[PDB]
Amino acid sequence: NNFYSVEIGDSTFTVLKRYQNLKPIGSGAQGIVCAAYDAILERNVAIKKLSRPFQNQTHAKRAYRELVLMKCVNHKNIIGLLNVFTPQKSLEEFQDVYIVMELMDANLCQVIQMELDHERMSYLLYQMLCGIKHLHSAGIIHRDLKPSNIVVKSDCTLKILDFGLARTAGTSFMMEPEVVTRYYRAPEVILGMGYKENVDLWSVGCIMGEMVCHKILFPGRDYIDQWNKVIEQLGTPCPEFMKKLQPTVRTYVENRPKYAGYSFEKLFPDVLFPADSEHNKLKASQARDLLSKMLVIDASKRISVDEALQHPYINVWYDPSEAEAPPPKIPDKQLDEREHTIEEWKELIYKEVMDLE
């Protein structure tokens, strides 16, 4: 054949010889991801092996949107899709999908382990915010933002990653509200309410905060202690919000201890923030203010994406082209609630993976 193989742990990659000398760099959920050199390209690239392309009726729905979205969404702040293929010859044989994307130096966790200066931290946050926006402009939510899904480059550019849980609007409180990474779940998700665009904005808070403190904001020993860590921090949400909770959740939420919460001045004392200058927009004050507008329990009151891109701490970087870009366009083929059969799927994964390279 043309492809080949290499021993990458308890698994094996069967790729086009054009991608040489592999090495693992990520133990994710949608599959392992290797960093390699694309000879033909003359630039090192990232390759994701899709684990059981259609094992459960669930792994499909995601592995699909990943593909689709990987395609229909292009923005300078969102990991570009380089290639996709499959070492298999035909349907009956098909059972593996490989994804090739650009390749960044590292993951945000890396930044979180270092001090930034306003300029940096604000630019990144900016970039991060542009990426999301572009997605939102299509009603497309990411639902799972976190360091792990954000990558940087020696030249300080930011690129968003992963689209498994990516989906639209949000019919309700999904089915498995566990799928999103704990530490970054937004109240609407924890209390199973039903999300809007800004659900991502909450995650953005958890991130920036972490980037500021250098440790996870709202830890949480389990799916439920999560809510606890949140309220112990921002204080019990007000009745208006309670009234919005399902009847069962409501009860429990109200039966908890009544936490007041701490002022953001104490949650993020000026020190923790990159050393202020004299400049006004790039100031701890301002940076701290954004946070307070994102780390909000009642989503209806949480700064929308644009409002963020316009806020004084991110404002200094604004540029129509990046922010107000044109909305990406997904056909209408991709559904986030549709439901087919293990097999029925197997087909759409081919007839797509196919006409993609």
Binding site: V111, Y123, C156, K281, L282, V316, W317
Partner: peptide, 10 residues
């Protein structure tokens, strides 16, 4: 104000 171009990742 101008955009940052370097980022130490070590």
């Amino acid at each position: 104000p101008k955009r940052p171009t370097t980022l130490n990742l070590f």
